[PDB]
Amino acid sequence: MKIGSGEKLLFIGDSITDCGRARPEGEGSFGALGTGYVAYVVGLLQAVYPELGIRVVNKGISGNTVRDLKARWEEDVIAQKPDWVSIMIGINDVWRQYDLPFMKEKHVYLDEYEATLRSLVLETKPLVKGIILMTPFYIEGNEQDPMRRTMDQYGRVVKQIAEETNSLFVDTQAAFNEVLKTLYPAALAWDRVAPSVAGHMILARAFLREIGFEWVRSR
Amino acid sequence: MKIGSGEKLLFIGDSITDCGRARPEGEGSFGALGTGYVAYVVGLLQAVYPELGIRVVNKGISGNTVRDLKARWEEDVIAQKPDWVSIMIGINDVWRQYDLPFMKEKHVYLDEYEATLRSLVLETKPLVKGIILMTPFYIEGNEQDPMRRTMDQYGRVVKQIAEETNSLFVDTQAAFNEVLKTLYPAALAWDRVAPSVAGHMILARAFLREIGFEWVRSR
Amino acid sequence: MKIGSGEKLLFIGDSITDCGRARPEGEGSFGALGTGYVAYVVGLLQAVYPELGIRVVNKGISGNTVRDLKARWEEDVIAQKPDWVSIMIGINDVWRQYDLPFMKEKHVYLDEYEATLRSLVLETKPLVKGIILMTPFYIEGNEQDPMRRTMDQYGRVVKQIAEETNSLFVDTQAAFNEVLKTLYPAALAWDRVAPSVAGHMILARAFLREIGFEWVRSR
Amino acid sequence: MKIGSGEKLLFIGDSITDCGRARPEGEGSFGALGTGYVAYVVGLLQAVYPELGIRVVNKGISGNTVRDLKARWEEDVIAQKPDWVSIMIGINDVWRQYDLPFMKEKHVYLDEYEATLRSLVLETKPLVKGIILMTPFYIEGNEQDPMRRTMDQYGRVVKQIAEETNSLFVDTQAAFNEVLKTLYPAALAWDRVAPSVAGHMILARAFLREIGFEWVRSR
Amino acid sequence: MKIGSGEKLLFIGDSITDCGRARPEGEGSFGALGTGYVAYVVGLLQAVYPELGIRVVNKGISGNTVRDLKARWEEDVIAQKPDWVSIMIGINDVWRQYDLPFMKEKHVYLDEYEATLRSLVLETKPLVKGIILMTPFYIEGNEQDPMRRTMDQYGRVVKQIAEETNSLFVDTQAAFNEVLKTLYPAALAWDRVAPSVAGHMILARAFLREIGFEWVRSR
Amino acid sequence: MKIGSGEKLLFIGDSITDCGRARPEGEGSFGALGTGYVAYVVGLLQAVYPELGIRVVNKGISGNTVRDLKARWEEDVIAQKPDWVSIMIGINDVWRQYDLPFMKEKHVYLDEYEATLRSLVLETKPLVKGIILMTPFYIEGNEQDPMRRTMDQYGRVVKQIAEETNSLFVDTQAAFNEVLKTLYPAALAWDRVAPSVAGHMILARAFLREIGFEWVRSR
Amino acid sequence: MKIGSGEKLLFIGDSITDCGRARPEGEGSFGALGTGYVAYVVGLLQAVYPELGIRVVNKGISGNTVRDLKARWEEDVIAQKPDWVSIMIGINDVWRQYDLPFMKEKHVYLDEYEATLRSLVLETKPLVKGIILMTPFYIEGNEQDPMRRTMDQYGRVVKQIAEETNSLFVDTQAAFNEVLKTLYPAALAWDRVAPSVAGHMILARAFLREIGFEWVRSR
Amino acid sequence: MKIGSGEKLLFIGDSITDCGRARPEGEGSFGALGTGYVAYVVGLLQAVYPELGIRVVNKGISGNTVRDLKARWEEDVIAQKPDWVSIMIGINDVWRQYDLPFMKEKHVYLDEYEATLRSLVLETKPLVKGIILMTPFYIEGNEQDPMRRTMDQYGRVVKQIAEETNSLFVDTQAAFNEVLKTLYPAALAWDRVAPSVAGHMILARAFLREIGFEWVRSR
Ligand SMILES: [Cl-]
Ligand SMILES: [Cl-]
Ligand SMILES: [Cl-]
Ligand SMILES: [Cl-]
Ligand SMILES: [Cl-]
Ligand SMILES: [Cl-]
Ligand SMILES: [Cl-]
Ligand SMILES: [Cl-]
């Protein structure tokens, strides 16, 4: 378990992170974390490591792109003095290119995305114990579907950044890809983005595996 | 994994099982399974065993005792033709004795509890592939608190029926007891009964472990 | 114009047809026809052929398959004594196979679909002046996506019944396909099924063209 | 098609334009345009010219007279940097004279109306590719009904302005007049102002005809 | 005053009579009589003839034609044992011809109107002390508007039945006509049917004058 | 009729005047005047004198005492530039003495009441055509009931003020007293203050009689 | 204390008893007893006699007269097998005579009141351990107010039945009368019937004193 | 009775005091005091000492610790110029230690609690006639339950402070302890903190006993 006792773990992202969490503070055991993967992570950490006393904060905001993260980073991240920051962003940065292909101010292209995400990591790294970069995802098994193909480009950038900055790394697309060998996307999310409890569990598990969570502790 | 491909798993119980499930069907949407351990179970099974093709049904009803289960058993269990039935009942059977001590017809005392639950297990066993008996629980660490002491006795009844009937058995009290070495009850549930996400994860993990779930499959 | 003065045109289908229509009557206010292609059809007919005096009824019901149509056919179609019946069914028959793959009784497979739809068309044809058969559709441009591939097969069934029965025929998939040369699905419908105003205009225009509507009447 | 690819088309007016559109921005494919003729225009343009990539904004505000348009013109029009502006105003400027004939500060008389509308056109013309002036209307077939007779005076002024400024021109009253040869007003709008889907389609079609929309493109 | 001490006066009609009255009783609170002319009548009678001890019942139902009255006559009129029955019906009988011209079964044409209303008056007259027949009305000053022209014909029917049957008679159209020498319809009712407080006062005053009310009693 | 054409009549008072009127402006034919005596007055004036073109504004505010009137007089009265002001105040000034007999900052005693009301009249008189002073009231027939006895003292002061300032005068208590010879208070208002439609008609009539309203005009 | 351990005490009445109690059971939660004197009684008994183990049921129904009690007596009283029945009825029996003087079938005059209440007491007495008869009341200090005078007569009937039948007896009017030496009615209840917390405490204290409650137990 | 006529009694605390009281003023006989022990105290004082004319204000705020009281003391207490101040605080100061044992900024430890509470008393004492210190409580009969054991430490501090400052003193824990000899906590409050009407009556009675309330006055 990478996260130590008494430490503060902060999640940021878009609606997949937000999941109806309490605004502004996003902190507490009884609904304030929202109802998706963040909450599941905390639940599992408390069920299996209750003695760790890990404080968890949810700063997800529905609709955000990486440009929106940068715009609130000082207030929502820096000022919170976290020990661990988990970032999952990119879905909207890409989706807007496909659902509003002519409202282009809504799009964040890849080279802007890469530099902005890097800028967030590099600002934050000297202030925290660790950073966890979660790729965006798209629940779609055809690599050549245009949005899936774009999303994968953004996920490759995330991986690159994590390597180069010594951040932890969660490939959420690889986790979905496995389940997509069996299930058609609609069984997980009609819109291919916002999933079921199952999708959130896929994400929660992917995150917990990367931080060295044990389902039954050996120690 | 005790549960196998193509099987229908039906959960029944009180509010801990219900958690806002869709009535009457308790199946078949996103959200139809409720927002507690039953949903978490189905999500983790889907995340880790997507190919198993399990159908899951949530017949939990808030407020039920085992007397209420008996009254709807035919329509809600037997008529559903499940392959597997999971029962978690007893919390209200006990809690009414303590919160409404003078309304005795709302109590289900130990003789009624054992005979009824026994009868339901005996009746159902030959019609299904398997039964899972979950103990009720009380989120309270002091064995001599009166309601914890009573709830532990009711759990002994469940354990003994499961043994007699070669049912699977989940000791939910023991799962909470482990966490209660560290956390005061209120950290998990103000009222010592209806817990947080963490509590429902304690439950879901206790269920899954009993049915041979692996967090990361070795094969 | 195939539809003539004084005729009653009854539309039946699933949510794509329903679009919040008034239940049970589906006629006779402002708003009773719902807010999608059925209403747009009635509006354009009124704008361009005000003198035609068409009565229009919307018997769409959200969630329906052709099995559901059959169960209400007598009350909702035959008892209404329509002159013209428009049917657009199949989306849910197919989508349940993909979004709830393990709940097989909710699926309407191709044998049940063809026999039922056929039976309804055969039964209705001698009681009415005319039938319009609209294909189901899936807003997805890749023919080998599994649900698009299945939906195209169901459309072939509709086309063949319409041919056998000398019904009018609207290929809604082809209409979407044309736009999908330019737009990614999400621009029209996140879930690839329930579209925007633009999608409903694609539908209404496909219907109208089949019934000989002219945007500006040449006579 | 007068409108070219990538261009921005902005509609302004009163409730007939507003139709519940999103405030303040009035822009987007999924409800932000409101539910009347603006939305229908955009829907048809996307269904038939999807590749044009026309951005559309709805700045209608219920209750407005031309005096209200002038009061918000800088923020709602100029600042938006549209390529094409469509104006439909006058209904309220006239209605108030008839429904609140003694709260006269609510009235905009014809010579004030004419000069204010001219002032809007002349300010805007050097900043855009084109302007479309839609007459107000009143759904009433008797030319001598007092409100209809007044409304027609205002429509004549609009036509004059469009001629003199080389603006495009939509005679909405002429479009209703045709349908009113068959339908009594109440079949379109009980209040003779705010119509049904049919009325909105009459308006949408009138607008699309003036911009050179083709229902089936020859090219 | 035609109405006398201790008598029960029952009003029946459509929405103009209903005005949100309490269903089913239409009597007996504060507010049970609705918020239009029926309530105003009861208030003025109470203000000026408090000692009369009149019981008043409002059996108006929004949307009703005389065909609807007939279907509930036994339960809503005869079973109430009124001493006086006031009927104001015809607006919807006529308006459906104009707002839904093609839904002919919703129309109540003049032959059905005269026969039904006649039958109800003949049947009720020997069971009660008196009947008041109020004409329907249309708030429209042009006699040749088609719906006003039709409504005036229906009023002639009412006047003739009242004459034949020695019923009291209230010409509501004439009352509106007087005000319409000064006000355009919209000042009283946008839709020419459901008026303001002023319109309901026009009605209440027309009723009261017919029953010999004095604003200031001379005795 | 004391009120001439084109003139502005403003009512101020407490909840008996307010009756849910539109805040802040309190002006319009379709609900803005609220649902009690103000609205009835306007309704009758329009039904019988439609050609007068009297503008009416309702500045009633529930809970007000005369001290509250003074606090808003500049904004709510002076600034409105009325031609006629009607004041009805005192109910709360007195009620508070009886319902909150120990929260005394809520009480306005008689000599404060008298001087404040005088101050309002004397400020306003040089700015308007006329002032109408309506007494407060209490719907209670026993002159010696403590609140009734107090209320009458306040009504005597109002009368004195009106005499001394040449204001018009409405004795609302005398109007209720007449009806109270027959009806027990509860038949008009359970709380003896806020009446039924009948009470509002008693008030409306009292006001209209003082301004020279004719129910059937001789001229 | 007249009530003893293990006994079921059932309260019945009108709104004063109901106070929002849970329907139909009126027992068994927190809140099921309503928010007035019945709840206060149960609370004080629990605070001071926790060991008594009393079951309490609230069968009050807003609006009831003794005629309504009779119609539900079998289901709501006798079928509950109470040991003690407390009845407080008469307020509406009387108040309808005054607030709806002309709707005579809603009145329960003294002959009907005495015979019915008598019959219910006689019928119930041999089936239960004891009966408590509470007078109705009117919060009004003037004995010659007409409704107070009538209510006092109805109270005399209750007192006489209680005497005849050796029922316990609570004179609620006398309890209010004592406070009314100091407070005007409006301080306790604007409408002289439905009081504040203070009024319900007056009631609860009057009940408790009659059943031998001690505020501080001497033993 | 320690409280004299005309005096102002102000209660402050957490949710147990607040009970939904009116914000900000917390003053009035008809709901403004909230629905728990404060309201019951006032009710009893009015029922038994109506002539005292005691003004009562409720400044409870749900969630408060003693640190929160200090933060609002000037506005909510000092500025109100009370004659008597009742303080009940500590529940949250302690609860947070047990329900959010790792969000420690939410905890107020005992020595901070003691000094802050002292600081409140010492500031206030020279400004008022008297102060009443009510201990916090926890509805839990086992002295060794961790939260109960902590709560008792805080109650001992309260008692010490009251002794040292000559404040009145209410041991709310001792009052619950008596009832807990018979009832399990859940019969009074599932969460062991927020009780039933019974709990509020236990508190109300404890407070009234300390101020010398007599249930039947000797004088
Ligand atoms: Cl999002
Ligand atoms: Cl439960
Ligand atoms: Cl559907
Ligand atoms: Cl408008
Ligand atoms: Cl109607
Ligand atoms: Cl008021
Ligand atoms: Cl009642
Ligand atoms: Cl609290």
Side-chain angles (χ1 to χ4, degrees), chain B residues 14-16 61-64 92:
Chain B
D14 57 32
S15 67
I16 308 306
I61 296 192
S62 189
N64 273 16
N92 294 311

Side-chain angles (χ1 to χ4, degrees), chain F residues 136-201:
Chain F
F137 63 86
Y138 191 54
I139 301 177
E140 169 52 53
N142 185 2
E143 296 179 356
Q144 291 310 307
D145 173 273
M147 183 164 165
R148 170 68 195 281
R149 176 181 177 285
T150 298
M151 198 77 72
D152 285 351
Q153 297 180 295
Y154 283 62
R156 285 189 283 271
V157 154
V158 176
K159 185 169 174 149
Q160 286 170 45
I161 297 171
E163 281 162 357
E164 289 175 3
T165 58
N166 298 134
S167 290
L168 300 177
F169 176 64
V170 184
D171 190 342
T172 67
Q173 188 66 58
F176 281 103
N177 290 343
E178 181 71 11
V179 176
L180 289 162
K181 291 169 159 164
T182 300
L183 302 179
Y184 184 81
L188 289 176
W190 285 5
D191 65 11
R192 297 183 275 170
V193 159
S196 56
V197 171
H200 281 93
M201 279 299 184

Side-chain angles (χ1 to χ4, degrees), chain B residues 95-96 98-99 101-102 138 140 142 145-148 182-187 190-192, chain H residues 95-96 98-99 101-102 138 140 142 145-148 182-187 190-192:
Chain B
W95 198 11
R96 295 299 83 76
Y98 294 95
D99 74 346
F102 304 125
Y138 192 50
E140 168 55 58
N142 177 14
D145 171 275
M147 182 166 168
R148 174 59 200 285
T182 301
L183 298 179
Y184 188 82
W190 285 3
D191 64 10
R192 292 183 287 170
Chain H
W95 211 355
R96 300 288 90 75
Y98 286 100
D99 77 345
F102 312 115
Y138 191 54
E140 169 52 53
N142 185 2
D145 173 273
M147 183 164 165
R148 170 68 195 281
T182 300
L183 302 179
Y184 184 81
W190 285 5
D191 65 11
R192 297 183 275 170

Side-chain angles (χ1 to χ4, degrees), chain C residues 8-9 82-86 124-125 127-132 166-168:
Chain C
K8 185 199 279 206
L9 163 57
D83 305 297
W84 287 85
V85 177
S86 181
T124 298
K125 182 201 229 273
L127 306 185
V128 302
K129 310 191 176 181
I131 294 174
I132 298 114
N166 308 299
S167 290
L168 299 182

